[PDB]
Amino acid sequence: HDCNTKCQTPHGAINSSLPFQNIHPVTIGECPKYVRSTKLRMATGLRNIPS
Amino acid sequence: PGDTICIGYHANNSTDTVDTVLEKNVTVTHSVNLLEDSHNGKLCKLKGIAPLQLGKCNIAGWLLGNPECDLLLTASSWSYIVETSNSENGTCYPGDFIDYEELREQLSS
Amino acid sequence: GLFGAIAGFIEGGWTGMIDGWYGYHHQNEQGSGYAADQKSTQNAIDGITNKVNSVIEKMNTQFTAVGKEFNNLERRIENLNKKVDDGFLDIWTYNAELLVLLENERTLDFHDSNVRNLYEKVKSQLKNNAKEIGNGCFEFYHKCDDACMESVRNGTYDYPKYSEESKLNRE
Amino acid sequence: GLFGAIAGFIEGGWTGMIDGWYGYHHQNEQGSGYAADQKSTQNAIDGITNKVNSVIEKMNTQFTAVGKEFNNLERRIENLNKKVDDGFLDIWTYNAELLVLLENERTLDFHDSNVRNLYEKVKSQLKNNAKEIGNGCFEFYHKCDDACMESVRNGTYDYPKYSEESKLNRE
Amino acid sequence: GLFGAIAGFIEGGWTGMIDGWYGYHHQNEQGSGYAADQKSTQNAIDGITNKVNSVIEKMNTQFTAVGKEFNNLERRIENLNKKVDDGFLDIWTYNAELLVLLENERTLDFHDSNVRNLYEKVKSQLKNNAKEIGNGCFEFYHKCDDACMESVRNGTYDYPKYSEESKLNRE
Ligand SMILES: *[C@@H]1O[C@H](CO)[C@@H](O)[C@H](O)[C@H]1NC(C)=O
Ligand SMILES: *[C@@H]1O[C@H](CO)[C@@H](O)[C@H](O)[C@H]1NC(C)=O
Ligand SMILES: *[C@@H]1O[C@H](CO)[C@@H](O)[C@H](O)[C@H]1NC(C)=O
Ligand SMILES: *[C@@H]1O[C@H](CO)[C@@H](O)[C@H](O)[C@H]1NC(C)=O
């Protein structure tokens, strides 16, 4: 389709400034590093204790 | 019944969870995802240049000008080359395409 | 936690404090309310933002990295390519998952530290003009109005001013 | 240590407490003995077990993976292979050694934190009904029998019940 | 800092203390001066030296590694070589930068911890023979000459000797 991207994979293009991705090891262009992780979430705030 | 001041910390309705070294499934008030798992399901341009679609032809079929690939005769510029699952037309006369993989790597340039 | 405060001697969090990560709840004749500590909160926000940004910033993007193709007389080099790609994948996946684990622990501990330091700061400001309950709260031995409370919050509480009155009421 | 307790103001450990990582030794009129603090010990065990398991778990197995062979006009690709294997060896050896170093430090520090926090927890229950010796021990200003001791250990100590008596012996 | 002492309740450092990382300033009738704590300073120096040495020590040197060359029909393997070299460069640069960031934070926090622990050491030696000012200072309720000060500096302070004078002056 006529879209623009920095990063293309065989499943579709990725548009992200994130360091890692789990979509595909094959990439063309300027992409995140491929890893096998299914989640990578950094805490910013604290333990949530509403109780 | 005297005046009071308390020291305390934030809570909210966030359901975000993170894993830590000592403990799994910790609910936290705020967090940021570092892992992209979403894509748009499309083939897009790179450097504002469209890819080349070989369609039912492959690179051999294209370059040699396999007669089924006549629709590719007008193709002129691209950011990357796309073969699809129906690209079956290449060398219609049987034999070997020498240094074909090298030529393919070169041609992407 | 490492510093013993969050989920520690201060048992739970405050859904009523919407304007900060850490802060104060007060009760007096004049009323009741929550207030964020701006200094510690802003320092923590800046620090943690710098941490996340610093993790992401160190990842120069993956520029073109493409699969190599191979003919039927190239199994060894195809396998070399697959070994390299798999090896790099093992390394980056292990490091990213483990790094996120470790950094999450450090972040939570950082918050615990900030809460402990705010509590001990108030404790050391007030000294014996108030009694520590133990649950993060202080009960004043003297009347402490809104201005006084604010003096506590901005670190200008005047201990000698209320010391005599406090000594009188404490006994 | 970072938190000052283990190998700190508490110079040494107790070979007589065989049933937990942390706990209490008491002496009173009914007799004398050790008892592990079950909660902190179990929390630490679970945490550390999770740490070790998380280190091991992140090494997705190496599926069948082998060395490559090369003919006499393939020295360059053989050397590429060797460069890859050696490079991976450098990365994994450095990372494993350094990771083990840093995590060992963290584990020891985690224990130090748990001891300090247990001590301050007891301290905050007892307040001035006991005097701090300084070596991790508290001396009561009131009689404290076995039930009382257990109340101290499980965080149900009744400060008001013994406050007047304590006040009597303290003065 | 994490432990609240350096850039914390002790607001600034001492350009007048030239002989150690941590220590004491005293003032009495006999005179005034700074003195480094040798034991804690040397322990910290040894620790940090071991950390730096351990970082450098884990990089067994890179023996000969030279660029490989390729002809015009070897572009794919040339690109494999480039992928390998770039992949290793990305990994080592990211790891070195991130490691230096994290370890620098840990080092600063380590210093903060050592100052806090030194402060609590003095506090626990002196007990109620002095009042905590709050800025890292203690005011004696008794006269404390050079020998007494030195007992504090070397961790041999005698609470009962000055206890009586202190109790008298405190009231
Ligand atoms: C959770 O609470 C916040 C604060 O009011 C609110 O903005 C948000 O809508 C809530 N969650 C929902 C219903 O999406
Ligand atoms: C802190 O609070 C008092 C009470 O009103 C106020 O007068 C004073 O200006 C404040 N101090 C600071 C930090 O500006
Ligand atoms: C703790 O011990 C006291 C004294 O025996 C007892 O009354 C109380 O029920 C105990 N609490 C718990 C947590 O079981
Ligand atoms: C501590 O100070 C006293 C008095 O100056 C001195 O006699 C003693 O040698 C010192 N003790 C230690 C352990 O250094």
What are the DSSP E strand ranges found in C15-154? 22-28, 31-36, 130-132, 137-140
Query: E strand or H helix at A29, and its extent?
Result: strand A28-29
In whole angstroms, give the CA distance from residue B13 to residue B32.
16
Q: Which residues contact E20 (CB under 8 A, 6 or more apart)?
A: E35, E36, E37, E38, E41
In whole angstroms, give the CA distance from residue D34 to residue D13.
12
**Does the beta carbon of B23 lie under 8 angstroms from any beta carbon of chain D?**
yes
Of the candidates A14, C24, C108, A27, the one whose C-alpha atom is nearest the C-alpha of residue B21 is C108
Nearest chain A residue (CA) to B41: A12
User: How far is the first Cα of chain B from the last one, in angstroms, to the nearest whole number?
Assistant: 81
Burial call C66-86: b when 16+ CB within 10 Å, e when fewer: eebebeeebebbeebbebbbe
Q: Put residue E117 in one of left, alpha, beta given phi > 0 → left and psi -120 to 50 → alpha.
A: alpha
Nearest chain B residue (CA) to D107: B22
Residue from D122, D146, D151 whose mutation best tests the ligand 3 pocket (most atoms within 8 A of CB):
D151
Distances (CA, A) of B50 to A5, A8, B56, B72: 10, 12, 18, 14
Q: Tell me the one-letter amino acid at E90.
A: D
The number of the ligand nearest the C-alpha atom of D147 reads 3
Helices D75-126, C75-126: inter-axial angle, 10-degree rounding: 20
Of the candidates E115, E133, E128, the one whose C-alpha atom is nearest the C-alpha of residue E160 is E128
In whole angstroms, give the CA distance from residue D19 to residue D35.
8
Helices D75-126, D146-153: inter-axial angle, 10-degree rounding: 140
Cβ contact A43–C107 (<8 Å): yes
Method: X-ray
Q: Where do breaks (C to N over 2.5 Å) occur in chain C, by preceding residue number?
A: none
Chain D: closest CA distance from residue B8 (Å): 18
Query: E strand or H helix at E33, and its extent?
Result: strand E31-36
Q: Which residues contact B106 (CB under 8 A, 6 or more apart)?
A: E75
| Eight-state DSSP code of residue C128 | G
| Eight-state DSSP code of residue B74 | T
The CATH number of residue E59's host domain is 3.90.20.10
Taking only residues 77 to 96 of chain B, the set having a beta carbon closer than 8 angstroms to any beta carbon of chain D reads none
Tokens of E51: 């950390």
In whole angstroms, give the CA distance from residue C38 to residue C21.
9
Residue nearest to atom 2 of ligand 4 (CA): E151
Of the candidates A26, A41, A38, the one whose C-alpha atom is nearest the C-alpha of residue C100 is A41
Strand B45-46 relative to strand A4-5: parallel, antiparallel, unpaired?
parallel
The angle subtended at Cα B99 by Cα B97 and Cα B102, nearest 5°, is: 130
| Eight-state DSSP code of residue E40 | H
Tokens of C44: 């923590």
Residue nearest to atom 13 of ligand 4 (CA): E154
Residue nearest to atom 14 of ligand 4 (CA): E154
Contact in structure between E59 and C56 (CB atoms under 8 Å): no
Residue D154 Cβ contacting ligand 3 at under 6 Å: yes
Q: Tell me the one-letter amino acid at E30.
A: Q
Of the candidates D145, A47, E112, E25, the one whose C-alpha atom is nearest the C-alpha of residue C12 is A47
Chain A: closest CA distance from residue C113 (Å): 11
In whole angstroms, give the CA distance from residue C14 to residue C24.
10
Residue D156 Cβ contacting ligand 3 at under 6 Å: yes
Query: E strand or H helix at B90, and its extent?
Result: none
Of the candidates A16, D54, D70, the one whose C-alpha atom is nearest the C-alpha of residue B21 is D54
Of the candidates D17, D34, D15, D36, the one whose C-alpha atom is nearest the C-alpha of residue D25 is D34
Contact in structure between C139 and B58 (CB atoms under 8 Å): no
Cβ contact B12–A48 (<8 Å): yes
Tokens of E124: 């626990």
Of the candidates B91, B25, B87, B101, the one whose C-alpha atom is nearest the C-alpha of residue B58 is B87
**Does the beta carbon of C51 lie under 8 angstroms from any beta carbon of chain B?**
no
Ligand 2 atom, smallest distance to C150 CA:
2
For chain C, which residues lie within 8 Å of any Cβ of chain E, measuring from their own Cβ?
54-55, 58-60, 65, 68-70, 77, 80-81, 84, 88, 91-92, 95, 99, 110, 113, 116-117, 120-121, 124
Contact in structure between C139 and B1 (CB atoms under 8 Å): no
Chain B: closest CA distance from residue D52 (Å): 9
DSSP states of E43-94: HHHHHHHHHHHHHHHT-PPP---------TT-HHHHHHHHHHHHHHHHHHHH
Tokens of C168: 């009188």
Query: E strand or H helix at E7, and its extent?
Result: none
Burial call D1-36: b when 16+ CB within 10 Å, e when fewer: bbbbbbebbbeeeeeebeebbbbbebeeeeeeeeeb
Query: E strand or H helix at D131, and its extent?
Result: strand D130-132
In whole angstroms, give the CA distance from residue D3 to residue B31.
28
Contact in structure between E117 and D8 (CB atoms under 8 Å): yes
Cβ contact C80–E80 (<8 Å): yes
Q: Which residues pair with D6 in a beta bridge?
A: D10
Strand E23-28 relative to strand E31-36: parallel, antiparallel, unpaired?
antiparallel
Mutate to test the interface with B, among D50, D106, D110 (most CBs of B within 10 A): D50
Q: Which residues pair with E35 in a beta bridge?
A: E24
In whole angstroms, give the CA distance from residue E170 to residue E140.
9
**Does the beta carbon of C23 lie under 8 angstroms from any beta carbon of chain B?**
yes
Cβ contact E2–C84 (<8 Å): no
Cβ contact B3–C108 (<8 Å): no
Please give the distance, rounded to the nearest whole angstrom, from the Cα atom of residue D151 to the centre of ligand 3. Answer: 5
Chain CA centroid to CA C8, Å = 14
**Does the beta carbon of A10 lie under 8 angstroms from any beta carbon of chain C?**
no
The number of folded domains in chain E is 1
Q: Which residues of D touch E103 (CB under 8 A)?
A: 102
Please give the distance, rounded to the nearest whole angstrom, from the Cα atom of residue C124 to the centre of ligand 2. Answer: 18
Distances (CA, A) of E15 to C72, C101, D10, E12, E27: 73, 40, 33, 10, 17
Taking residue D122's Cβ as centre, other Cβ atoms within 10 Å add up to: 18
Contact in structure between A21 and A14 (CB atoms under 8 Å): yes
Mutate to test the interface with B, among C9, C71, C126 (most CBs of B within 10 A): C71
Pocket of ligand 4 (CB under 6 A): E 147, 150-151, 154, 156
In whole angstroms, give the CA distance from residue B89 to residue A4.
29
Contact in structure between E153 and E22 (CB atoms under 8 Å): no
What are the DSSP E strand ranges found in B1-109? 4-9, 17-18, 26-27, 31-33, 35-36, 45-46, 52-53, 81-82
Contact in structure between D23 and D6 (CB atoms under 8 Å): no
> How many A-C residue pairs are in contact by the CB < 8 A criterion?
92
Cβ contact D110–C2 (<8 Å): yes
Q: Tell me the one-letter amino acid at E48.
A: I
In whole angstroms, give the CA distance from residue C27 to residue C40.
22
Strand A7-9 relative to strand A12-14: parallel, antiparallel, unpaired?
antiparallel
Contact in structure between D20 and D37 (CB atoms under 8 Å): yes
In whole angstroms, give the CA distance from residue C58 to residue E95.
9
Radius of gyration of chain C (CA): 27
* Reported resolution, Å: 3.3
In whole angstroms, give the CA distance from residue E115 to residue E3.
9
Cβ contact A46–C111 (<8 Å): yes
Query: E strand or H helix at A42, and its extent?
Result: strand A41-43
Taking residue C49's Cβ as centre, other Cβ atoms within 10 Å add up to: 12
Q: Which residues contact D89 (CB under 8 A, 6 or more apart)?
A: none
Tokens of C33: 């309310």
In whole angstroms, give the CA distance from residue D169 to residue D149.
18
Contact in structure between C30 and D142 (CB atoms under 8 Å): no
Of the candidates E1, B21, E10, the one whose C-alpha atom is nearest the C-alpha of residue C114 is E1
Of the candidates B80, B82, B105, C62, the one whose C-alpha atom is nearest the C-alpha of residue E77 is B105
Mutate to test the interface with D, among C6, C74, C80 (most CBs of D within 10 A): C80
Please give the distance, rounded to the nearest whole angstrom, from the Cα atom of residue E112 to the centre of ligand 2. Answer: 29
Contact in structure between C96 and B34 (CB atoms under 8 Å): yes
Tokens of D134: 């300084």
**Does the beta carbon of D50 lie under 8 angstroms from any beta carbon of chain B?**
yes
Distances (CA, A) of C118 to B102, C24, E75: 65, 10, 62
Ligand 2 atom, smallest distance to C151 CA:
2
Strand E130-132 relative to strand E138-140: parallel, antiparallel, unpaired?
antiparallel
- Subunits with 3+ Cβ pairs within 8 Å of D are B, C, E
Q: Which residues contact E93 (CB under 8 A, 6 or more apart)?
A: C58
Nearest chain B residue (CA) to D110: B22
Domain containing D91: what range?
1-171
Q: Tell me the one-letter amino acid at B19.
A: D
What are the DSSP E strand ranges found in C10-165? 22-28, 31-36, 130-132, 137-140
- Looking at A1-51, list the stretches that DSSP marks H as alpha helix, in order from N- to C-terminal side: none
